[model samples]
Target: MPTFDHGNLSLGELELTVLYDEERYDIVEQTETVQVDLEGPRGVLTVFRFARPSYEVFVDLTEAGEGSHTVDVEHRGFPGDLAVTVEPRMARVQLEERQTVSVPVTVEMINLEHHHHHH
Candidate 1:
């Protein structure tokens, strides 16, 4: 029931979605996991959860200010934090104007040395 969108969420583009339920909030859970690096359609930078537990992405907006703002979230079974220019430090969301966070990609980097040497 939660969703997010960019003006141009092109195909194959990774986007982040946000919700207002802590019960549905997702984050990195496995401490033994590694951060995944990825790119975007317009060269946006992002990270993803790989070889880790798939979880929900939610923020503790309980103390966020009463201003309206939009966060950029890429929905690829992973999560990303928006480059929030404004601090969400109030009791609720204050998203009034239009903001955007570029959708990330699911592409990952191949550590050839590790793959070949480890094997």
Candidate 2:
């Protein structure tokens, strides 16, 4: 029958790179995604695209703070004899503590009547 699509594969999301400590924590989910599980040897499709395997997810907030934090989804570059797995290892970040505000700049003069009729 010869019809297979790479064995054991469930790579969804897969887009995480968070290394906190950005001026005293302030990460309200800028972007994070992870959910991978790859195995090896199946129907042999060019050896699974020339031994394709590479993953990394080590969320470090450098002693996080502020609130709602349960980060612990650490993993490393795959390819150590295949058989990788990483899903909901532990991640639920939402820290906040970096506020600096200073607003007061109002300048309204649209066209100014054609610059006072070109003076």
Candidate 3:
């Protein structure tokens, strides 16, 4: 996740994770859990998991510019690989093992000004 002081551009990865518990399904299989960060800059890929001992994930994000953008994510393990590729040209995301991921990228134009009176 990246941080900015004050600007029209700033980004932080949004993620959700689900863990399998014996309270539900009972499948016997050894799976590897790995943590990975998502790549930014017009590429569709997000979500990562930690390997075996660690059942966690670390996602990465980058916001370089403003005025509309596109993002896609690839989440492995849990949901048979996920991906998205949407821009200011489309709406609604179809990453449920579907095709294409349309996302909304809006930049609200705002005015910035400052004044100071010194004696």
Candidate 4:
């Protein structure tokens, strides 16, 4: 049987983020795994060991809004000959809206007269 050496595969980053309209979203709370299938000769599989295959995972949030949404997991950068697929084709992500708050600060002068006399 041809061996598939994708066991040691890794993601491009531990967390993935997407920005739209100056707003950002992230997928951190959940972890997804990639699967690889080998169809070529054993020699080809050896090359993979030396390279330690890796892929970048991303989700489209352009149409997403604040709240929980189900987005499809997409991947890139894999050998053309090999078959690659993510464990869960769909991922549930929480989209949070950016919050901005403005508060007024008051400044008061108490000992101005005392300081003036000392000077």
Candidate 5:
């Protein structure tokens, strides 16, 4: 799948964007999948490839970690291992806390495909 066109990008040449930048942030035996098509610099941009497989997780309470953590999230390119635990961050006045155990996990990377073409 090849189709790239960016015939316009004025206004200081947009801002910032990078995909597959030197790869291997690690996603459990990953794969490759890239697709992008921009019309101008202000319209026509539905570069949301991924008809299947998905991953999106985020939970940051000041880097929740210190018990049971096995985070792994990567869609399309493989890897989806997530198992974090929490409930141990204290320092209360009169005593009252239990913000869901303890641990950290948040991964957002997608590119899984499943274009089944039944004949």
Candidate 6:
């Protein structure tokens, strides 16, 4: 048996960046594809995938930070005559509290119609 000694190692300046693509969408009548891409990892990690057709991006907007924030929304899809509601779209939230925000999304549809005979 041979003895080995390894020194302490460190990964410096690990940066976690978020990047996304833009698309056009009118309505979300059915399930859609919401692609998520991950980049800048040269054999540093593994297993990154998205199983949902659509994805929601959320961030901490509670306390006032001393930095810049960017938000981008891409509009692209079919018009399934759906209506959506997003409460507190842009609001300052309280810190150290359980914050509850909601987004009510609804999809409208038309049932089968019958024709009547005219005189």
Q: Is candidate 4 or candidate 6 better by TM-score?
A: 4
Worst 10 residues of 4 by lDDT: 103-112
Report the C-alpha lDDT of model 3 over 84-116, residue by residue, as the tens digit. Answer: 221221211212222332333332343434455
Per TM-score, the best of the predicted structures is: 4
Q: Model-by-model lDDT, in order? A: 0.31, 0.61, 0.27, 0.48, 0.24, 0.27
Candidate 6 Cα errors over 4 Å, as ranges: 1-73, 79-98, 112-119
Residue ranges of candidate 3 with Cα displaced over 4 Å:
1-95, 116-119
Model 2 stretches astray by more than 4 angstroms: 1-6, 9-17, 26-35, 39-53, 58-65, 69-86, 94-119
TM-score of every candidate relative to the true structure? 0.21, 0.29, 0.18, 0.47, 0.16, 0.18
- Cα TM-score of candidate 5: 0.16
For 8-43, candidate 1 gives per-residue lDDT tens digits of: 211222112334433432222101111333333222
lDDT of 5 by residue, 1-119 (tens): 97655433111111111122112221222112222212342232222222232322222222322233333321222122222221221211111123332222223353435678745
Span of ten consecutive residues with least summed lDDT in model 2: 103-112
| Residue 8, model 5, lDDT | 33
Q: How do all the candidates rank in terms of lDDT, highest first?
A: 2, 4, 1, 3, 6, 5
User: How many pairs collide in each candidate, listed in order?
Assistant: 20, 0, 15, 0, 10, 7
Model 1, C-alpha of 116: deviation from truth (Å): 5.7
lDDT of 2 by residue, 63-104 (tens): 878777786676776543556666777788767876642333
Native-to-model Cα distance after best TM-score fit, residue 90 in candidate 2, in Å: 7.6
Comparing 1 and 6 on TM-score, the stronger one: 1
Q: Could you tell me which 10 consecutive residues in candidate 5 have the lowest summed lDDT?
A: 9-18
Candidate 3: how many backbone clashes?
Answer: 15
Please provide, for model 6 over 11-89, each residue's C-alpha lDDT reduced to its tens digit, 9 standing for 90 to 100.
1111111221122111112121222232333222221212212224343333323233433322222121223223223
lDDT of 5: 0.24
